[PDB]
Each structure stands twice: as structure tokens, then as C-alpha cells.
Amino acid sequence: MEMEKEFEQIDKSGSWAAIYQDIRHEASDFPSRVAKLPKNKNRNRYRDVSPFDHSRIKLHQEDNDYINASLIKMEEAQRSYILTQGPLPNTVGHFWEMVWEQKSRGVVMLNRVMEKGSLKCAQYWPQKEEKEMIFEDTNLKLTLISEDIKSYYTVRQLELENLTTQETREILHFHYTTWPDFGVPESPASFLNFLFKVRESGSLSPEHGPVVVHCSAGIGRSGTFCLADTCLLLMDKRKDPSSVDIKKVLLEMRKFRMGLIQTADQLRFSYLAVIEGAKFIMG
Ligand SMILES: O=C(N[C@H]1[C@H](O)[C@@H]2O[C@H]1c1ccccc12)C1CCC1
């Protein structure tokens, strides 16, 4: 079926939970043996969220190459994404090592450091220009260059320096700051505006490594971001945009990381975002 009328048909019939459970039943199951090794327990935020072995990002380190991060490679859309958990106190150096080694231009953050009165990720970037951060375990230096605070999101320019080689690179930090503590946003308008700002920066384009996207577990809000982006790109590429099937795209993405889209409300919100976004694109 088309999307917008399939949407109204699920609303009128109140069957979002059943649609979402079907997706959960059909989703891929691949091994995640490296994630479960005892030496990696303090590298995982949640015991039930792990990268598959076949798609995990490897650190370029001979001691321990493990990070909780996955490469989502979308062949028809010609887009790739790295989805990862919010960094932990003992993985902030690994996180920036990955950004460096994978040649990423942009980092997309969809959570606040504290939500619901608890810590959802480490403070992994500097908050003042004159107070830079040094990660001694991976030999990187990170400096805040500029910050632009808007009503729904903040964009930061960061400098990452590899202290071994003295090479430097500019990284863009895109921080969506207004996702509610509970539920999903009422309108997708600010989330779509944010997606378009990431696109306009070059961070999603083939001349760079994959964008790094995270929330707390790296599957819920993060899944919504890449699902909406890929579906909109396919609607622009194809002769028949009504042939894009959001459930099929989501199942394709779940071949590369488990659990993408965590609730039926997040699924409905993803439909809403693609539907509204397809009208603004045109034409
Ligand atoms: O090359 C880098 N760091 C080097 C450190 O001197 C040390 O050797 C390298 C390294 C890599 C992983 C852990 C520890 C080390 C950074 C470029 C991204 C990582």
C-alpha cells in the first residue's frame, strides 16, 4: 500500500502495536559473540543492546578492537551510517578513535546528557573554547571552536587532533536538544528541519566517511533518524515514489543493528516524518 493512506488505515483501526510486533518477529537474528566476551562488559551500556559481529565497527588496535557501534550500509540509497550507544566514562577515547579512523565529518546526538534525572551518556566534548580535552588512552586532543545555539538544536564546530601525527580535522557536532523525556514529538517539523541541516553540511555525503549517530542505546531515536533520511532519498531516486515501503526499509536496516525503532510510537512518528517530509521536498 501507499504510505499516507496505510497510515490513516492503521490510525483508524488502532493497530500500531500489532504492526510493530510483526516487525519484531520478522527481524534478523545474527550472532554478537564479541560484544558478550567478559572483557567487554564495561564497554556496553545495556546488556540487551549489542552490535552484530558481521557489521560491527572495529577499532584499529591490537589489544581490544571492540566498540558498541554498527555500520548500516544502504545499497540502493547509496548512504551509510554508523549507529552507536552514547559514550560511557571508559569509552569516550574509543568513540573519538572511531570518528578519526572512519573519516567521519559529522556526529549526530539525539539525547541530552541527563534525562529523567539519570545520566544517559558521558560529557564527551568540551564546553569552553579554552578548556580542551585530551584522551590519553587513544592519544587524541579535542577543542571546541564555535557553538551556535538555536531553539531546537545546537551546532558545534570541533577540532580533532591525532597527537601521534599532528594531523588535524574539523568535526561538526549536530545536537538535537528537544526530544521529550517521554514519548515522541507531537509534530515532526523540528526533527525534519534538523535532518535537513545535517544534510546541508555535507556530513551525509559520499566524499566523507559515514556519519556517526547516537542516542542513549543507539537504536531508538537513532533508528528514526536514519530510517527517515533513507526513505526520503529513495522517494527522490525512484520513478514511482509511492513504491517506497517503510516497513521493508526498516527490516533491511535491522540486518545491520538489532532493535532499530524501540516502540510503536516511534514507528508511527517515523511514518509521520516521511509523509510530511515528502511534501516539502517538492517539488
Ligand atoms: O593513532 C591514534 N593513537 C595512537 C596512540 O599513540 C596509540 O597508538 C595509536 C593507538 C591507537 C589506539 C589506542 C592507542 C594508540 C589515534 C588516531 C585515532 C586513534
mmCIF file of C-alpha atoms in Angstrom, residues 8-278:
data_model
loop_
_atom_site.group_PDB
_atom_site.id
_atom_site.type_symbol
_atom_site.label_atom_id
_atom_site.label_comp_id
_atom_site.label_asym_id
_atom_site.label_seq_id
_atom_site.Cartn_x
_atom_site.Cartn_y
_atom_site.Cartn_z
ATOM 1 C CA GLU A 8 -4.698 6.570 8.196
ATOM 2 C CA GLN A 9 -5.821 2.947 7.955
ATOM 3 C CA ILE A 10 -3.637 1.982 10.940
ATOM 4 C CA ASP A 11 -4.785 5.015 12.931
ATOM 5 C CA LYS A 12 -8.483 4.331 12.320
ATOM 6 C CA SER A 13 -8.006 0.645 13.138
ATOM 7 C CA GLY A 14 -5.689 1.323 16.100
ATOM 8 C CA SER A 15 -3.291 -1.470 15.149
ATOM 9 C CA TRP A 16 0.133 0.179 15.568
ATOM 10 C CA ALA A 17 1.155 -2.311 18.268
ATOM 11 C CA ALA A 18 0.333 -5.264 16.018
ATOM 12 C CA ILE A 19 2.228 -3.817 13.044
ATOM 13 C CA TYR A 20 5.255 -3.166 15.255
ATOM 14 C CA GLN A 21 5.189 -6.660 16.770
ATOM 15 C CA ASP A 22 5.192 -8.149 13.249
ATOM 16 C CA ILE A 23 8.403 -6.224 12.519
ATOM 17 C CA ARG A 24 9.940 -7.539 15.741
ATOM 18 C CA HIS A 25 9.002 -11.121 14.788
ATOM 19 C CA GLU A 26 10.467 -10.899 11.255
ATOM 20 C CA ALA A 27 13.689 -9.065 12.214
ATOM 21 C CA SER A 28 17.080 -10.694 11.630
ATOM 22 C CA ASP A 29 18.982 -12.544 14.366
ATOM 23 C CA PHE A 30 22.753 -12.728 13.871
ATOM 24 C CA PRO A 31 25.486 -13.547 16.420
ATOM 25 C CA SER A 32 27.053 -10.879 18.673
ATOM 26 C CA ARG A 33 29.756 -13.036 20.281
ATOM 27 C CA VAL A 34 32.456 -10.350 20.576
ATOM 28 C CA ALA A 35 30.091 -7.982 22.451
ATOM 29 C CA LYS A 36 29.409 -10.666 25.067
ATOM 30 C CA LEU A 37 33.031 -11.531 25.923
ATOM 31 C CA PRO A 38 33.718 -10.854 29.635
ATOM 32 C CA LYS A 39 36.495 -8.362 28.880
ATOM 33 C CA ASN A 40 33.940 -6.113 27.120
ATOM 34 C CA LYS A 41 31.335 -5.828 29.916
ATOM 35 C CA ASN A 42 32.262 -2.252 30.821
ATOM 36 C CA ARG A 43 32.147 -1.260 27.110
ATOM 37 C CA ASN A 44 28.370 -1.877 26.859
ATOM 38 C CA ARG A 45 25.748 0.436 28.341
ATOM 39 C CA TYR A 46 22.858 -2.071 28.142
ATOM 40 C CA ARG A 47 23.186 -5.849 28.319
ATOM 41 C CA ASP A 48 20.429 -6.406 25.729
ATOM 42 C CA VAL A 49 21.777 -3.974 23.049
ATOM 43 C CA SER A 50 24.805 -5.335 21.186
ATOM 44 C CA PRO A 51 26.320 -4.968 17.672
ATOM 45 C CA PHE A 52 26.225 -7.990 15.372
ATOM 46 C CA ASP A 53 29.652 -9.485 14.629
ATOM 47 C CA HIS A 54 29.246 -9.154 10.851
ATOM 48 C CA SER A 55 28.608 -5.380 10.854
ATOM 49 C CA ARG A 56 30.421 -4.129 13.978
ATOM 50 C CA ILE A 57 32.979 -1.308 13.700
ATOM 51 C CA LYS A 58 36.487 -2.465 14.612
ATOM 52 C CA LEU A 59 38.944 -0.142 16.339
ATOM 53 C CA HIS A 60 42.448 -0.177 14.788
ATOM 54 C CA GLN A 61 44.028 -1.533 17.942
ATOM 55 C CA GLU A 62 45.549 -4.959 18.551
ATOM 56 C CA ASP A 63 44.777 -5.205 22.284
ATOM 57 C CA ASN A 64 40.998 -4.823 22.138
ATOM 58 C CA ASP A 65 39.211 -3.723 18.970
ATOM 59 C CA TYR A 66 35.685 -3.643 20.438
ATOM 60 C CA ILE A 67 33.220 -0.731 20.461
ATOM 61 C CA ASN A 68 29.401 -0.899 20.648
ATOM 62 C CA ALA A 69 28.824 0.504 17.105
ATOM 63 C CA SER A 70 27.431 -0.851 13.803
ATOM 64 C CA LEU A 71 27.797 0.044 10.080
ATOM 65 C CA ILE A 72 24.378 0.374 8.409
ATOM 66 C CA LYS A 73 25.107 0.216 4.593
ATOM 67 C CA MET A 74 22.048 1.057 2.418
ATOM 68 C CA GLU A 75 22.864 -0.152 -1.102
ATOM 69 C CA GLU A 76 20.029 1.281 -3.231
ATOM 70 C CA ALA A 77 20.011 4.643 -1.433
ATOM 71 C CA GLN A 78 23.836 4.855 -1.533
ATOM 72 C CA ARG A 79 24.059 6.051 2.075
ATOM 73 C CA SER A 80 25.969 4.618 5.046
ATOM 74 C CA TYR A 81 25.567 5.390 8.765
ATOM 75 C CA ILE A 82 27.413 4.344 11.930
ATOM 76 C CA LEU A 83 24.934 3.841 14.813
ATOM 77 C CA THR A 84 26.420 3.709 18.326
ATOM 78 C CA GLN A 85 25.475 3.985 22.020
ATOM 79 C CA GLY A 86 26.092 7.145 23.994
ATOM 80 C CA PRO A 87 29.728 7.022 25.135
ATOM 81 C CA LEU A 88 30.491 5.695 28.662
ATOM 82 C CA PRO A 89 33.124 7.131 31.028
ATOM 83 C CA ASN A 90 35.518 4.351 29.936
ATOM 84 C CA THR A 91 34.740 4.585 26.184
ATOM 85 C CA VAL A 92 34.994 8.312 25.333
ATOM 86 C CA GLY A 93 38.511 7.790 23.957
ATOM 87 C CA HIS A 94 37.345 4.800 21.873
ATOM 88 C CA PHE A 95 34.470 6.923 20.479
ATOM 89 C CA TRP A 96 36.796 9.638 19.125
ATOM 90 C CA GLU A 97 39.254 6.984 17.869
ATOM 91 C CA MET A 98 36.379 5.587 15.754
ATOM 92 C CA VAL A 99 35.451 9.037 14.393
ATOM 93 C CA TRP A 100 39.092 9.546 13.358
ATOM 94 C CA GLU A 101 39.675 6.087 11.850
ATOM 95 C CA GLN A 102 36.380 6.019 9.880
ATOM 96 C CA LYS A 103 36.978 9.572 8.443
ATOM 97 C CA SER A 104 33.588 10.866 9.631
ATOM 98 C CA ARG A 105 32.780 14.555 9.191
ATOM 99 C CA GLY A 106 29.731 14.747 11.467
ATOM 100 C CA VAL A 107 28.391 13.409 14.788
ATOM 101 C CA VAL A 108 24.593 13.448 15.349
ATOM 102 C CA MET A 109 23.444 13.396 19.033
ATOM 103 C CA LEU A 110 19.700 12.897 19.737
ATOM 104 C CA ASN A 111 19.690 12.835 23.587
ATOM 105 C CA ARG A 112 20.578 15.125 26.483
ATOM 106 C CA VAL A 113 23.424 14.147 28.835
ATOM 107 C CA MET A 114 20.835 13.929 31.690
ATOM 108 C CA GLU A 115 17.240 12.786 31.069
ATOM 109 C CA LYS A 116 14.634 11.588 33.602
ATOM 110 C CA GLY A 117 17.107 12.544 36.365
ATOM 111 C CA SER A 118 19.748 9.985 35.294
ATOM 112 C CA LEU A 119 22.879 10.106 33.126
ATOM 113 C CA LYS A 120 22.252 8.936 29.524
ATOM 114 C CA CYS A 121 25.828 9.468 28.244
ATOM 115 C CA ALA A 122 29.163 10.949 29.245
ATOM 116 C CA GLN A 123 30.054 14.629 28.709
ATOM 117 C CA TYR A 124 32.334 13.674 25.824
ATOM 118 C CA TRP A 125 33.032 17.078 24.184
ATOM 119 C CA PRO A 126 34.413 20.344 25.661
ATOM 120 C CA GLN A 127 32.019 23.086 26.743
ATOM 121 C CA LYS A 128 34.501 26.018 26.682
ATOM 122 C CA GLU A 129 36.981 27.053 23.980
ATOM 123 C CA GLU A 130 39.857 27.477 26.458
ATOM 124 C CA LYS A 131 39.301 24.070 28.201
ATOM 125 C CA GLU A 132 40.234 21.404 25.666
ATOM 126 C CA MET A 133 40.053 17.635 26.277
ATOM 127 C CA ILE A 134 42.896 15.125 25.979
ATOM 128 C CA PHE A 135 42.138 11.386 25.680
ATOM 129 C CA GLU A 136 45.342 9.734 26.810
ATOM 130 C CA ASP A 137 44.366 6.119 26.107
ATOM 131 C CA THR A 138 43.939 6.881 22.357
ATOM 132 C CA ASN A 139 46.256 9.953 22.030
ATOM 133 C CA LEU A 140 43.699 12.464 20.725
ATOM 134 C CA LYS A 141 43.021 16.114 21.530
ATOM 135 C CA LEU A 142 39.596 17.725 21.087
ATOM 136 C CA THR A 143 38.911 21.502 21.078
ATOM 137 C CA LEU A 144 35.655 23.480 20.900
ATOM 138 C CA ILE A 145 35.974 26.024 18.031
ATOM 139 C CA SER A 146 32.462 27.582 17.955
ATOM 140 C CA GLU A 147 28.908 26.898 19.108
ATOM 141 C CA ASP A 148 25.564 28.046 17.628
ATOM 142 C CA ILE A 149 22.567 27.516 19.981
ATOM 143 C CA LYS A 150 19.111 27.512 18.362
ATOM 144 C CA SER A 151 15.671 26.807 19.770
ATOM 145 C CA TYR A 152 15.533 23.082 18.926
ATOM 146 C CA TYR A 153 19.181 22.140 18.321
ATOM 147 C CA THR A 154 22.796 23.282 18.723
ATOM 148 C CA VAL A 155 25.623 23.002 16.121
ATOM 149 C CA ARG A 156 29.243 22.923 17.261
ATOM 150 C CA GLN A 157 32.498 23.108 15.338
ATOM 151 C CA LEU A 158 35.178 20.879 16.895
ATOM 152 C CA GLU A 159 38.886 20.290 16.098
ATOM 153 C CA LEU A 160 40.166 16.731 16.499
ATOM 154 C CA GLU A 161 43.959 16.294 16.545
ATOM 155 C CA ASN A 162 45.788 12.993 16.267
ATOM 156 C CA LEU A 163 48.656 13.662 18.673
ATOM 157 C CA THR A 164 50.789 10.853 17.166
ATOM 158 C CA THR A 165 50.920 12.508 13.705
ATOM 159 C CA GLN A 166 49.877 16.127 14.479
ATOM 160 C CA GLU A 167 47.200 15.888 11.778
ATOM 161 C CA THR A 168 44.007 17.858 12.475
ATOM 162 C CA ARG A 169 40.415 17.656 11.201
ATOM 163 C CA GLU A 170 37.232 19.669 11.569
ATOM 164 C CA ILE A 171 34.245 17.722 13.002
ATOM 165 C CA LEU A 172 30.661 19.051 13.073
ATOM 166 C CA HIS A 173 28.502 18.173 16.144
ATOM 167 C CA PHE A 174 24.734 18.279 15.495
ATOM 168 C CA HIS A 175 22.823 18.120 18.812
ATOM 169 C CA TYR A 176 19.032 17.774 18.777
ATOM 170 C CA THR A 177 18.186 19.069 22.252
ATOM 171 C CA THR A 178 14.361 18.968 22.454
ATOM 172 C CA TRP A 179 13.230 15.313 22.140
ATOM 173 C CA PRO A 180 10.852 14.861 25.119
ATOM 174 C CA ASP A 181 11.830 12.751 28.142
ATOM 175 C CA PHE A 182 8.745 10.543 27.476
ATOM 176 C CA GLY A 183 7.115 9.649 24.145
ATOM 177 C CA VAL A 184 7.839 11.284 20.760
ATOM 178 C CA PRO A 185 7.429 14.856 19.429
ATOM 179 C CA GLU A 186 3.904 15.948 18.566
ATOM 180 C CA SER A 187 4.994 17.341 15.162
ATOM 181 C CA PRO A 188 7.932 16.132 13.009
ATOM 182 C CA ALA A 189 8.659 19.656 11.778
ATOM 183 C CA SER A 190 11.639 20.433 14.017
ATOM 184 C CA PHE A 191 13.142 16.942 13.552
ATOM 185 C CA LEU A 192 12.924 17.316 9.736
ATOM 186 C CA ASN A 193 14.418 20.822 9.875
ATOM 187 C CA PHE A 194 17.288 19.279 11.875
ATOM 188 C CA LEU A 195 17.753 16.435 9.347
ATOM 189 C CA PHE A 196 17.971 18.992 6.527
ATOM 190 C CA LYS A 197 20.651 20.963 8.433
ATOM 191 C CA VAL A 198 22.776 17.813 8.778
ATOM 192 C CA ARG A 199 22.329 17.136 5.032
ATOM 193 C CA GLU A 200 23.244 20.696 4.045
ATOM 194 C CA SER A 201 26.555 20.454 5.972
ATOM 195 C CA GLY A 202 27.990 17.651 3.774
ATOM 196 C CA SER A 203 28.157 15.218 6.713
ATOM 197 C CA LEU A 204 25.990 12.585 4.963
ATOM 198 C CA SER A 205 27.717 12.765 1.580
ATOM 199 C CA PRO A 206 29.986 10.188 -0.124
ATOM 200 C CA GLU A 207 33.125 12.369 -0.018
ATOM 201 C CA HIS A 208 33.287 11.691 3.744
ATOM 202 C CA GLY A 209 33.232 8.609 5.969
ATOM 203 C CA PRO A 210 29.849 7.618 7.452
ATOM 204 C CA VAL A 211 28.115 10.000 9.857
ATOM 205 C CA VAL A 212 28.188 8.777 13.493
ATOM 206 C CA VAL A 213 24.676 8.876 15.058
ATOM 207 C CA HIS A 214 23.796 8.130 18.693
ATOM 208 C CA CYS A 215 21.246 8.462 21.457
ATOM 209 C CA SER A 216 21.490 6.513 24.733
ATOM 210 C CA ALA A 217 21.290 2.920 23.351
ATOM 211 C CA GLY A 218 21.782 3.870 19.680
ATOM 212 C CA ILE A 219 18.654 2.087 18.368
ATOM 213 C CA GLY A 220 15.520 4.150 19.057
ATOM 214 C CA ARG A 221 15.798 7.863 18.205
ATOM 215 C CA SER A 222 18.939 6.944 16.182
ATOM 216 C CA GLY A 223 16.899 4.459 14.134
ATOM 217 C CA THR A 224 14.233 7.095 13.459
ATOM 218 C CA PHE A 225 16.882 9.494 12.048
ATOM 219 C CA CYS A 226 18.423 7.078 9.524
ATOM 220 C CA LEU A 227 15.077 5.489 8.559
ATOM 221 C CA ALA A 228 13.572 8.880 7.702
ATOM 222 C CA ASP A 229 16.675 10.011 5.785
ATOM 223 C CA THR A 230 16.914 6.805 3.693
ATOM 224 C CA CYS A 231 13.168 6.695 2.865
ATOM 225 C CA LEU A 232 13.169 10.331 1.673
ATOM 226 C CA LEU A 233 16.266 9.726 -0.511
ATOM 227 C CA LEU A 234 14.623 6.665 -2.132
ATOM 228 C CA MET A 235 11.464 8.699 -2.891
ATOM 229 C CA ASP A 236 13.671 11.166 -4.824
ATOM 230 C CA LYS A 237 15.617 8.492 -6.731
ATOM 231 C CA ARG A 238 12.768 6.227 -7.933
ATOM 232 C CA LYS A 239 10.354 6.692 -10.837
ATOM 233 C CA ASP A 240 7.449 5.758 -8.529
ATOM 234 C CA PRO A 241 7.861 7.320 -5.054
ATOM 235 C CA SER A 242 4.749 5.525 -3.753
ATOM 236 C CA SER A 243 6.675 2.251 -4.090
ATOM 237 C CA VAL A 244 8.832 3.072 -1.038
ATOM 238 C CA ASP A 245 7.804 0.677 1.768
ATOM 239 C CA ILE A 246 8.939 1.989 5.155
ATOM 240 C CA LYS A 247 8.481 -1.391 6.878
ATOM 241 C CA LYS A 248 10.705 -3.091 4.270
ATOM 242 C CA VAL A 249 13.389 -0.395 4.633
ATOM 243 C CA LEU A 250 13.321 -0.812 8.431
ATOM 244 C CA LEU A 251 13.710 -4.591 8.147
ATOM 245 C CA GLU A 252 16.688 -4.056 5.778
ATOM 246 C CA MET A 253 18.318 -1.739 8.338
ATOM 247 C CA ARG A 254 17.710 -4.331 11.108
ATOM 248 C CA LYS A 255 20.008 -6.728 9.198
ATOM 249 C CA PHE A 256 22.856 -4.434 10.399
ATOM 250 C CA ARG A 257 21.831 -3.496 14.006
ATOM 251 C CA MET A 258 19.243 -5.030 16.338
ATOM 252 C CA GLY A 259 16.241 -3.228 17.772
ATOM 253 C CA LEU A 260 16.005 -0.156 15.500
ATOM 254 C CA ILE A 261 12.792 1.697 16.423
ATOM 255 C CA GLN A 262 12.002 0.782 20.054
ATOM 256 C CA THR A 263 8.249 1.449 20.338
ATOM 257 C CA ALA A 264 5.097 1.570 18.229
ATOM 258 C CA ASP A 265 5.022 5.328 18.913
ATOM 259 C CA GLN A 266 8.473 5.706 17.336
ATOM 260 C CA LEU A 267 7.219 3.705 14.328
ATOM 261 C CA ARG A 268 4.197 5.992 13.897
ATOM 262 C CA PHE A 269 6.431 9.050 14.274
ATOM 263 C CA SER A 270 8.753 7.749 11.528
ATOM 264 C CA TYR A 271 5.779 7.416 9.138
ATOM 265 C CA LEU A 272 4.662 10.946 10.014
ATOM 266 C CA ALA A 273 8.134 12.340 9.372
ATOM 267 C CA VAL A 274 8.498 10.707 5.946
ATOM 268 C CA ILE A 275 4.973 11.765 4.906
ATOM 269 C CA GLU A 276 5.464 15.423 5.819
ATOM 270 C CA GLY A 277 8.998 15.489 4.518
ATOM 271 C CA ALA A 278 7.976 14.245 1.079
#
